[PDB]
Amino acid sequence: HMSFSHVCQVGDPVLRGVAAPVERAQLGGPELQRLTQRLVQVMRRRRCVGLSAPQLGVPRQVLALELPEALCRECPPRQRALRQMEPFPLRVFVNPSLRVLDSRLVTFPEGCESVAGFLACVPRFQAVQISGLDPNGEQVVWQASGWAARIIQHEMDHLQGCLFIDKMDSRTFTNVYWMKVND
Amino acid sequence: HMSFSHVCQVGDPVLRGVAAPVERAQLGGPELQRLTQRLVQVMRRRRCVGLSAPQLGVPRQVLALELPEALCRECPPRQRALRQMEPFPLRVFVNPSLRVLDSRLVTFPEGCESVAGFLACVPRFQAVQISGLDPNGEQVVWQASGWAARIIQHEMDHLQGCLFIDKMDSRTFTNVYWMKVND
Amino acid sequence: HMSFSHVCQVGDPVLRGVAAPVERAQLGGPELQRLTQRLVQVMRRRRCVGLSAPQLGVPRQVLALELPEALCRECPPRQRALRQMEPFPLRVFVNPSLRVLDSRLVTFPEGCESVAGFLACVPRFQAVQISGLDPNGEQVVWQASGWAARIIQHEMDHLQGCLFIDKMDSRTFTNVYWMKVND
Amino acid sequence: HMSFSHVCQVGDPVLRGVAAPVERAQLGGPELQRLTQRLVQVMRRRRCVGLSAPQLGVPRQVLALELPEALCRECPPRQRALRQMEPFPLRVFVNPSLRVLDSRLVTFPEGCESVAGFLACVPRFQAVQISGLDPNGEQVVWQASGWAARIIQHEMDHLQGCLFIDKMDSRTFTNVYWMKVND
Ligand SMILES: [Co+2]
Ligand SMILES: [Co+2]
Ligand SMILES: [Co+2]
Ligand SMILES: [Co+2]
Structure with a gap:
């Protein structure tokens, strides 16, 4: 199967x-468990650090985020430190809301699995707090900064119908097969 | 061969x-002739109404525009009329400059052979004039409105390093395989 | 709407x-009319000469074919003659079958809206007959040669789950933005 | 820079x-060094396990392979075992030749940076030997099995003008945004 x-x-x-909220009658239920399992499976297959339900065709407020140690480790050390990229475990949020904690803007290239094959530089806030429910209805709050805060912002934008191409520095948009290199 | x-x-x-200007000494010469012939051939093969030399990898101020009646007629007459699409003959411009004559903005979906496979709505001026040299070196001023004005603007933008993704309504960006249809 | x-x-x-056949009980009915209208609207929007229901996500044996004079004339007359491209009116086929009338093979580049942005050369039979039902259940037959026969064979292949990449000369596969031109 | x-x-x-061979006189030389540095930089930026000089526009017999442990650990351990995927240090080969040591065929999905965004199943030999020069002219022979043998075969095919679409099971060709998953 x-x-x-x-x-x-x-x-x-x-x-x-x-995206519409998940109804309380759905919390802890099998339909929502299937959706969360699907999100996490695709996230793990594609090695994407976050993913949201609308990207699997489901217009509901659900997102997942996970950054394994191996993904961080594959980033060259200088880039890892500049991007403040550090591992964090799987979190699934249902009906989340976001508040900005540090409004300083940081710009790095970002892509999106729903605009396959392109990157562009996108300004994001340095630190944010995401609050919501886990799939069983328990309250979860996570204050995050750096690269974790960028992924949170990218996924929360997907629940609002917003894609990175709405926020990018368009002159940096590129196919992934084009890149800047050191001489 | x-x-x-x-x-x-x-x-x-x-x-x-x-793009750099074409030098006087190159006007009417074989190298510029090869370039204009190649632009026209590509433009005709791809059925695009305009093309510029930077898109063939040549950073020089040359562009070509042509809208055969068959291509107008393939647009449904309602959409054709809304877009003010009328045929025009081939013209090649060297070192052109643009003047905006009617700054009212008109918005329709536009694509770009150098961002293959996508469209987005882009506001463009209603009427403009392009003035420049032919490949032989005679001065031509071409005044146009509606769709022709849109294509002139798109090609002029290419000579200034600008692509439609820099000017679009980003919420309308789409792969060509997704479309709005009438119920 | x-x-x-x-x-x-x-x-x-x-x-x-x-694709499964359309059941006798659906012939003439409103769901099948909605499907055929949608096919034709997509085909006319994308300027594709044929389209099949599986390509709109509907695993039923329905396809449509149309080559307007305008679209035909967008092809240069030399190439049009070489490919034996001539205009033909809209036909919609339900539960079609194909008979080969002239088994000689003819090889030209073709593309497919469900593999957007690529072409490859594919050998096709020179002449075929498609027979099936129109949406109202009337028996209809069309004997076609040349480019029309190619488009018939491509849409019929879609009803059998076959895409051109299964029959192509793989060394000729190309992005549409690469092309061979005349010096 | x-x-x-x-x-x-x-x-x-x-x-x-x-691809043409690298001439004797060029071994250990500055032009070869520029090429090999470029190839390894691109390969490392894209995190592709292998890359060949034709893919950077240079029709010369030079390929590079590298699978660091972090990149390897991004693959889940069960798939890693099934694919016999193990880390290996950087090799750059100049004028390599390939000998098959175990002709048993193993089939898994493979992609290619020069056909960006697609995967297809491709049968490959289970074990091979690649013999060639390092950029300094020293003779190096590497006997590899499993996934390393696959990557060596894919890069050697690039030097002969062969892409994986020439050898794939075409019914398994897919955009990367479609995937099979476990319920
Ligand atoms: Co995204
Ligand atoms: Co353009
Ligand atoms: Co098709
Ligand atoms: Co490859």
């Missing part, structure tokens, strides 16, 4: 809508 | 530079 | 299934 | 040519 999943690509209106 | 040409894709720095 | 339609891309398993 | 590099995409005829 295997099935297919797909990450929706830009043009699909589900990516531009504002 | 046929040869290969390619249209450079976003990420290639040639699309973001400011 | 407006809605969105999308052409499923390679990877979607709907493109590799064998 | 700051310069751009790009991985050529399918359609560029450089990918279908047979």
Whole structure:
């Protein structure tokens, strides 16, 4: 028993809508457990550090985030330190809200699994707090900074119908097969 | 002995530079003739209404525009009328400058052979004039409105290192395989 | 009212299934009319000469074919003659079958809206007959040669879960932004 | 300093040519050194396990392979074991030749930086020997099995103008945003 999943690509209106809350009657239930399992499976397959339900075609407020040690480790040390990229365990948020904790802007290239094959530089706040429910209805709060805060912002934007191309420095948009190099 | 040409894709720095002028001594010469012939051939093969030399990898101020009646007629007459699409003959401009004559903005979806496979709505001026040299070196001023004005602006933008993604309504960006249709 | 339609891309398993027949009880009915209208609208929007229901996510044996004079004339007359491209009116086929009338092979580049942005050369039979039902259940037959026969064979292949990449000369596969031109 | 590099995409005829050998006189030389440095830099930026000089536009018999432990550990351990995926240090080979040591075929999905965004299943031999020169002219022979043997075969095919779409199970070709998952 295997099935297919797909990450929706830009043009699909589900990516531009504002996702509906998960109804309380759904908390702790099998449908929501299937959705969270699916999100995490695709995230792990694609090695993407976060993913949201609208990207699997489900217009609900659910997102997952996970940054394993191996992904950080593959980033050259100087880049890792400049991007403040450090590992954190899996968190799934249902009906989350975001508050900015440190509004200083930091710009780095970002991509998106729903705009496959492109990167552009995007300003993001240095630190944010995400608060919401876990799939069982318990309150979860996470204050994060650096690269963790960027991923949180990217996924929360997807629940608002916002993609990185709405916020990018467009002159840095590039196919991934083009890159800057040292001479 | 046929040869290969390619249209450079976003990420290639040639699309973001400011094209150099063509020097007087090159006007009417074989190298400029080869370049104009290649632009026209590509433009006709791809059925694009305009193309610029930076998109063939050549950072020089040369562009070509042509809208055959068949291409207008393939647009549904309602959409054709809304877009004020009318045919025009081939023109090649060398070292052109643009003047805006009617600054009212008109918004429709536009694509770009150097961002293959996407469209987005882009506001453009209603009427403009382009003045420049032909490949032989005679001064031409071409005044146009509606869709022709839009194509002139798109190609002029390429010579200044500007792509439509810099000017779009980003919430309308889409892969070409997603579209709005009538119920 | 407006809605969105999308052409499923390679990877979607709907493109590799064998489409089920339309049941006699659905012939003439409103659900089948909605499907045929949608096919034709996408085909006219994308300027593709044929399209099949699996490509709109509907695993049923329905396809449509149309080559307007305008679209035909966008092809240079030399190339049009070489490919035996001539205009033909809209035909919609339900539960079609194909008979080969002239088994001689003809090889030219073709693309597919469900593998957006690529072409490759594919050998096709020179002449075929498609027979099936129109949406109202009337028996319809069309004997076609040249480019029309190629488009018939490409859409029929979609109903059997076959894409052109299964039959192509793989050394000729190319992004559309690479092309061979005349010196 | 700051310069751009790009991985050529399918359609560029450089990918279908047979790369020329590096001449004796060039071994240990500055031009070869520039090439090998560039190739390794691109390969490391893209995190691709292997890369060949034709893919940077240079039709010469030079390839590079490297699988650091972190990159390897991004693959989940069960898939890593199934694929016999183990880390290995950087090798740059000049004028390599390949000998098959175990002709048993193993099939897994493979991609290619010059066909960005797609995967397909490709059968490869289970064990091979690559013999060639290091950039200094020293003779190096590497006997490899499992996933390393796959990457060596893929890069050696690049030097002969062969891409993985020539050898794939075409019914398994997919955009990377479609995937099979476990329920
Ligand atoms: Co995203
Ligand atoms: Co353009
Ligand atoms: Co098709
Ligand atoms: Co490759």
